[PDB]
Amino acid sequence: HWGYGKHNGPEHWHKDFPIAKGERQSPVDIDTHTAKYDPSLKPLSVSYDQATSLRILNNGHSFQVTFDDSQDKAVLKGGPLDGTYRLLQFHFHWGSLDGQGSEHTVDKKKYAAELHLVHWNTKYGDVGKAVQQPDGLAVLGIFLKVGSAKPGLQKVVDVLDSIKTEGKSADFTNFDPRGLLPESLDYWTYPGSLTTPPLAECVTWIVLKEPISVSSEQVLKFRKLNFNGEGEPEELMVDNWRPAQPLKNRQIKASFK
Numbered sequence: 414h415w416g417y418g419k420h421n422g423p424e425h426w427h428k429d430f431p432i433a434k435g436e437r438q439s440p441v442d443i444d445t446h447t448a449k450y451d452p453s454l455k456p457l458s459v460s461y462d463q464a465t466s467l468r469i470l471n472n473g474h475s476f477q478v479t480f481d482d483s484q485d486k487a488v489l490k491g492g493p494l495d496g497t498y499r500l501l502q503f504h505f506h507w508g509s510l511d512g513q514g515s516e517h518t519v520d521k522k523k524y525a526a527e528l529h530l531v532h533w534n535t536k537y538g539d540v541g542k543a544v545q546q547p548d549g550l551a552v553l554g555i556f557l558k559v560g561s562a563k564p565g566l567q568k569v570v571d572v573l574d575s576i577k578t579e580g581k582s583a584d585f586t587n588f589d590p591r592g593l594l595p596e597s598l599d600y601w602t603y604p605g606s607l608t609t610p611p612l613a614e615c616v617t618w619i620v621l622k623e624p625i626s627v628s629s630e631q632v633l634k635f636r637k638l639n640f641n642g643e644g645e646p647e648e649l650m651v652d653n654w655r656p657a658q659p660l661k662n663r664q665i666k667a668s669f670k
């Protein structure tokens with residue numbers, strides 16, 4: 414199966430998922446000087462007050478916290494979006510060292526990690542249906558830099574020892590994702606894709622300008638996870654990021670001057 418290694422990594426994915434070479438792939442480099450300020454973009458509306466987290470899972474490519482998306486409890490609205498998008502899960506991409514790990518880049522700068530909060534458009538009823546639509550998904554992307562600890566991330570970090578290997582999961586109730594957001598909701602937006610197989614071109618990307626800071630001890634715990642199943646040779650889950658893809662005929666828009 415696909416992965417992030419020499420033999421199965423991003424430059425190989427097009428063989429099983431030919432859309433990898435498509436017209437609206439993600440991530441991209443965000444050239445801050447070429448992004449156009451669009452004064453008609455609305456502020457983003459993040460309503461996570463009623464979010465219900467369920468489980469945390471090592472899926473062999475990242476770890477994810479999954480939410481109850483059977484009602485409008487944690488939704489994303491406004492911004493460049495038409496309609497209501499329910500929060501399904503969040504996960505991260507990170508590096509083997511602090512100088513890489515983010516999928517989006519800003520004027521070619523890589524961050525140590527990138528948080529993706531994945532939402533789907535309720536007009537399509539379910540995520541499987543939504544990934545087949547050009548406005549099916551909205552992913553809120555947040556950069557992580559290394560410095561001060563993020564207190565709101567610690568509950569996550571502390572359970573990772575229990576989901577070390579691919580397929581392990583644990584109960585992960587009462588986690589509040591509001592503790593992962595930066596102060597500002599200023600953002601860049603562009604039409605793109607999933608950054609993992611199946612690389613479906615169904616995503617409105619919303620990438621926040623302001624990074625969150627996490628501690629070296631927090632990111633070090635991400636790097637103790639494993640790509641492999643229990644009983645297989647130990648391969649650390651590091652560098653699980655797709656490089657920037659060609660922008661082609663797309664315009665990146667900014668919410669802010």
Ligand SMILES: [N]S(=O)(=O)[C][C][C][C][C][C]C1234B567B89%10B%11%12%13B85%14B%1158B%12%11%15B%139%12B%1061B%12%112C5%153B%14874
Pocket residue numbers: 529531540541544552606607608609610611
């Ligand atoms: N890195 S990122 O934020 O761009 C990743 C978002 C991927 C969200 C998952 C969507 C599906 B999973 B399950 B099936 B497999 B295929 B169908 B169903 B869920 B929807 C699709 B894949």
Ligand SMILES: [Zn+2]
Pocket residue numbers: 504505506529608
């Ligand atoms: Zn992601």
